[PDB]
Amino acid sequence: IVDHDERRRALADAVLALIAREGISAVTTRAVAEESGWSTGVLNHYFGSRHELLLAALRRAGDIQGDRYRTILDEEGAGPIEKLRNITASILPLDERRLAMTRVFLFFYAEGTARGEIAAFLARWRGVVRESVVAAQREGTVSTDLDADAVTVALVALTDGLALQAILDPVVMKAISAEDAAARCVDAAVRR
Amino acid sequence: HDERRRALADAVLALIAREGISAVTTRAVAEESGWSTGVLNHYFGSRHELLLAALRRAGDIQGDRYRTILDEEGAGPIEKLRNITASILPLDERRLAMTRVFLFFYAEGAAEETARGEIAAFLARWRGVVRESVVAAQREGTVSTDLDADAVTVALVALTDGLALQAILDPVVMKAISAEDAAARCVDAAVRR
Ligand SMILES: [Cl-]
Known part of the structure; x- marks a missing residue:
């Protein structure tokens, strides 16, 4: 399922640009028209x-x-644990892309379909995490005594708690800005 | 006057637990509270x-x-961490209302300074009580001396909060957190048991 409307894609990108720069409150049809160049x-x-x-x-x-x-x-060359660290990092609001994503998702979290969009986002995220937890278990790096479903629910919940608190609380923003922050999340979930 | 304000706030929470933020109106709070x-x-x-x-x-x-x-009396640090953790999970009317109203204000705080500072005070109070118990467990030898108490605290509070927020919109997470041992499992993850 892909959006083929290049203009709508451009408009949605201008919205995200505005969210990263000025916050969700700055989004209006007039501000997006001005940002994008369309009427x-x-x-x-x-x-x-x-x-x-x-x-x-x-x-x-x-x-x-x-x-x-x-x-x-x-x-090429990345293992299950590197992938999980990379997935976890990709949710953390540490640049403009991820700042905008966390802000727009938080806005719709509270309003909740598109709680359907939220569910889809969560299910795909758990999906890719679960595959890599299961891959790490198959490689013998993560205990096969662990339920991969529980590990996944824990890692996703921890990552999302961190991402959400971080946009509200500079204590947590500092915490997740540490180089090893994603690796620490993964280690906590899979038990090192 | 001050107890009346509190009773009215309690009425708002009762509506939030029962029917959500959208159920909060002047009329509904009057009906719930008994005040005109x-x-x-x-x-x-x-x-x-x-x-x-x-x-x-x-x-x-x-x-x-x-x-x-x-x-x-007779609760140890780990037990206290478990109970603290459980006290956040949306598993009765009190904690359901609490999670719903905080979630509303998380979104608002992602924009407005007044709400952001209320959320920040709440998180700091929560980390403060968690940290006290994490360091007490380290001092008794039950939690690893090589873990940083502040990092453990941030992680446990973030995990607990991620689970509580996800639970109110995701029925599988709700199921996961309602297991008897859910809070024990959160504490164990965070303290790298
Ligand atoms: Cl409780």
Whole structure:
């Protein structure tokens, strides 16, 4: 399932750019029209509610994230644990992309379909984590006494708690900005 | 006047537990509380003010829960960490309401300084009580001396909070956290047992 409308993709990207720069409150049809170079008429016929404009950004953020998973899983030489560290890092709001994604997801977390979008985001994230936990177990690096389902639920919950607190609380933002932060999350989940 | 404001905040929490944030209106809070809309209007200027009072009240009750837990005769540090952790999980009306109202304000705090500072105080209070118990366990020799108490604390609070927030929107996480041993498992993950 892909968005083929290059203009809608560009509009959703302008929304995310605005979210990273100025926060969700700065998103309006007028501000996005100004950011993107297209008319309020063009936007009003795509969306006609701020909610739909934000929802576009949520979906675009999810798609880019899915491409990140792909890049991470297909990296030559990387093992299950490196992949899990990379997946975990990719959720942490440590650059503009991930700052915008965390902000738009948090906005819709609270409003919750698209709690359907949220569910899809979570299920795909757990999906890629579970595969790599199971791969690490198969390699013998993670205890086969551990339930891969429980490990996955723990890692995803920890990572998301950190990502969400971090945008509210500079204590946690400092914590996740440490070079070893993703590796620490993974180690806690799989028990080193 | 101050007890009346508190009772009204309690009414908002009751609605939040039962039917969600969207159920909070002047009329519903009057019906729930027994106070007329004119008494409500005296204390609160807006629906948003009702919700902020609920956030503050939920945090205050949670503060009293910490003190009850920390004061339990014969409870050890690990037991206290377990009970602290469980006290956050949305497993009854109190904790369901609390998680729902915090989630609302997390989203708001992702934009507004007033709500952000309320969330920050709550998280710091919670880390403070967790850290006390983590260091007490290290001092008794039951938690590894080679772990950094602050890092363990950040991790446990983030895990517990991630699970509580995910639980109110994800039925499988809700199922996971309602297992008797859920809080024990969170503590063990965080202290790298
Ligand atoms: Cl409790």
